[PDB]
């Protein structure tokens, strides 16, 4: 059975939009602020993946053993309806 995982990060912005955010810079425990633009209000950016399993346990594992293989952590929300986990 296949479940979902939404990995999100925080953003702040203001055609041209200017934004900044904190990012991992070599090491899980270390972050750094950065600027970025395109061509003042809070925001959130999300990438989604789906590892296939059988229950909402193994999923919870693989999804924790993925935030492991990356500098990901934070709060975890779960909607059973869409089987969606949400790290932030």
């Amino acid at each position: 059975t296949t479940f979902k995982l939404a990995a999100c990060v925080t953003l702040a912005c203001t055609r041209v939009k200017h934004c900044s955010f904190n990012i991992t810079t070599d090491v899980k425990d270390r972050k750094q602020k950065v600027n970025a633009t395109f061509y003042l209000y809070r925001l959130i950016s999300c990438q989604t993946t789906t590892t296939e399993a059988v229950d909402a346990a193994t999923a919870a594992k693989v999804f924790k053993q993925y935030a492991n293989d990356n500098g990901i952590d934070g709060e975890w929300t779960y909607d059973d309806a869409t089987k969606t986990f949400t790290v932030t």
Epitope: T25, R30, K31, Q32, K33, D73
Partner: antibody
Framework: QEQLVESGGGVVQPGGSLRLSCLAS????????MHWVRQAPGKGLEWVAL????????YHSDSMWGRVTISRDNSKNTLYLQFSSLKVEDTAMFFC??????????????????????????????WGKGTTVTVSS | QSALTQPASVSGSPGQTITISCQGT?????????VSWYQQSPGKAPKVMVF???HRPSGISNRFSGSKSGNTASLTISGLHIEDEGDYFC??????????FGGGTKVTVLG
């Protein structure tokens, strides 16, 4: 062995100019912002100027603005203070002090500023001996 | 550009508790939790005793403590030792990212 050593102090005439310097050692100079603080004979400490680690942002007190310029040369661990249009009143001991700083902790993750730069902790954790500047006619 | 206001002079016996106040404005002391206190011993350079209102750097005795209320901050030394003698200066971050110091307080440990 964090150490700061000021020099260049001496006698100047009002209206004139003079450059002070502060030699740093015992720590990574270019990671820390730096202050100048003066103390007139028998008076209290008075903040003069602050310059960011990379030397791109400068701040000068309102009472000395126009008579001071702060700068630094990270390639030789030195902080400078350029005087001009000096007043008799500017006579004082000038101190070189380091701005405490580093990452900001939220959980177990260290957050650094633009270009992995330290945030300021808003206190001075290293001071020099100070050098005397005498403005006299 | 006018310094923070402190009492010119205070004193107490060894082992006595004393407090020094630091009067400011909403643009400095009452605008941030960034009040630091420095001690200046005769001959020596200044030295941080308390930062961020009530925090102590590594090495400083628990005797020293600070608090803040509105536009005034305070440093308390509960149990004066002889080495506490000297001049004390409060300091605050400003809303313009400057620093401003208080006029200074002479602390005498009655001997």
């Amino acid at each position: 062995q964090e150490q700061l050593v000021e020099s260049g102090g001496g006698v100047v005439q009002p209206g004139g100019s003079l450059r002070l310097s502060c030699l740093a050692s015992g720590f990574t100079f270019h990671k820390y912002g730096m202050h100048w603080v003066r103390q007139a004979p028998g008076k209290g400490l008075e903040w003069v100027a602050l310059i960011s680690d990379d030397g791109m942002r400068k701040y000068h007190s309102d009472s000395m603005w126009g008579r001071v310029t702060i700068s630094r040369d990270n390639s030789k661990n030195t902080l400078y203070l350029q005087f001009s249009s000096l007043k008799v009143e500017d006579t004082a001991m000038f101190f070189c002090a380091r701005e405490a700083g580093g990452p900001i902790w939220h959980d177990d993750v260290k957050y650094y500023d633009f270009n992995d730069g330290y945030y300021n902790y808003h206190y001075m954790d290293v001071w020099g001996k100070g050098t005397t500047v005498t403005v006299s006619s | 550009q006018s310094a923070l206001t402190q009492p010119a002079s205070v004193s107490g016996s060894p082992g006595q508790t004393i407090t020094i106040s630091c009067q400011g404005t909403s643009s400095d002391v009452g605008g941030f939790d960034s009040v630091s206190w420095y001690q200046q011993s005769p001959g020596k350079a200044p030295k941080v005793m308390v930062f961020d209102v009530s925090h102590r750097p590594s090495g400083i005795s628990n005797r020293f403590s600070g608090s803040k209320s509105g536009n005034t901050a305070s440093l308390t030394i509960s149990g004066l030792h002889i080495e506490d003698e000297g001049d004390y200066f409060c300091s605050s971050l400003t809303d313009r990212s400057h620093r401003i110091f208080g006029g200074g307080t002479k602390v005498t440990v009655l001997g």
